Design an enzyme around this catalytic site. Structure first.
Site, short mmCIF file in Angstrom:
data_model
loop_
_atom_site.label_atom_id
_atom_site.label_comp_id
_atom_site.label_asym_id
_atom_site.label_seq_id
_atom_site.Cartn_x
_atom_site.Cartn_y
_atom_site.Cartn_z
N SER A 16 -39.11 -20.23 23.57
CA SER A 16 -38.01 -21.37 24.13
C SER A 16 -38.10 -22.19 22.39
CB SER A 16 -39.24 -21.89 25.32
OG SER A 16 -39.72 -21.11 26.18
N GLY A 17 -37.08 -22.78 23.41
CA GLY A 17 -36.44 -23.58 22.42
C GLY A 17 -36.31 -24.86 22.98
N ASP A 127 -36.79 -33.51 16.65
CA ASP A 127 -38.40 -33.05 17.27
C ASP A 127 -38.66 -32.39 16.07
OD1 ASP A 127 -40.02 -32.36 19.33
OD2 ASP A 127 -38.79 -30.86 19.46
#
Length: 288
Positions: A16-17, A127
């Site tokens: 996932s991203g 992030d």
């Protein structure tokens, strides 16, 4: 025969991203595997096309993966990306939650440079975390790449370098574990915050864990209380002072300030040399 446009056969989910899932792909045209990012087109705020333009502005930088925006196929926006090696979070786990000081400093030098390059192209990442740095492949196995620009944001004007105004931005964007104190207080993020998050990532490597980790939105305030209650000098105690010096220098930067990337790299490079290490790119996982 499920393929993206006759070229890459789609495989299983590999991660996932931000804003979608990643699947394995096989370029029958070349011979390499690729990573394929898919985003459901059913949203009022699509992000994949935007993220792939940032990648396109960053191409040719060391440690920036090459991508290919292939547009929408029915219900999904598709972006094909260079498949790289394991993430630093993955490598941390192979190494049983222990990095040697040399490895941490080997990473620090490169992670500071990756962030500097992003900043040079007028974006902040927002992030910075161990999952968003991956080692390269092959002859690039010594190279740290930075990935995932889905929460990235332009911080200055591209032709005039007018920095975006100081303002209250009250969405926590990014992982709370590595968030800067300025973000916990609702302030718009800037270059200083990417580097403060790198400071926590480094100490996380050193400690294996952070004092605000396993805390029982209530948890988001729990982290922020604990993160602010924990002075830098206690967090980095029993480790070279350079990590404390790094973190204090990041917290003391002004919002619009251009960080002194050479200074931060030189803190660690000089400690590195004083321990007698050599920038030979022999990480802990290179001795099994």
């Amino acid at each position: 025969e499920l393929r993206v446009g006759n070229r890459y056969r789609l495989g299983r989910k590999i991660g996932s991203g931000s804003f979608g899932d990643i699947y394995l792909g096989t370029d029958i045209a070349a011979g390499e595997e690729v990573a394929i990012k898919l985003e459901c087109v059913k949203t009022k705020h699509p992000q994949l096309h935007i993220e792939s333009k940032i990648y396109k502005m960053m191409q040719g930088g060391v440690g920036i993966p090459t991508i290919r925006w292939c547009g929408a196929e029915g219900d999904y926006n598709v972006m094909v990306m260079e498949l790289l090696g394991p993430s630093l979070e993955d490598l941390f786990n192979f190494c049983s939650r222990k990095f040697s000081l040399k490895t941490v400093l080997l990473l620090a030098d490169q992670m500071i440079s990756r962030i500097e390059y992003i900043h040079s192209k007028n974006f902040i990442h927002r992030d910075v975390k161990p999952d968003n740095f991956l080692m390269g492949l092959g002859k690039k196995g010594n190279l740290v790449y930075i990935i995932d620009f889905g929460l990235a944001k332009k911080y200055r004007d591209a032709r005039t370098h007018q920095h975006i105004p100081y303002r209250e931005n009250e969405n926590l964007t990014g992982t709370a574990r590595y968030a800067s104190i300025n973000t916990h207080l609702g302030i718009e993020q800037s270059r200083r915050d990417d580097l403060e998050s790198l400071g926590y990532v480094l100490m996380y490597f050193n400690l294996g864990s952070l004092p605000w980790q396993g805390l029982k939105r209530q948890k988001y305030e729990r982290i922020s209380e604990k993160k602010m209650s924990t002075p830098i000098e206690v967090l980095c105690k029993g480790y070279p002072s350079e990590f404390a010096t790094y973190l204090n220098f990041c917290r003391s930067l002004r919002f619009d300030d251009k960080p002194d990337y050479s200074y931060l790299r030189q803190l660690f490079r000089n400690l590195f040399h004083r321990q007698g290490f050599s920038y030979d790119y022999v990480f802990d996982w290179n001795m099994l």
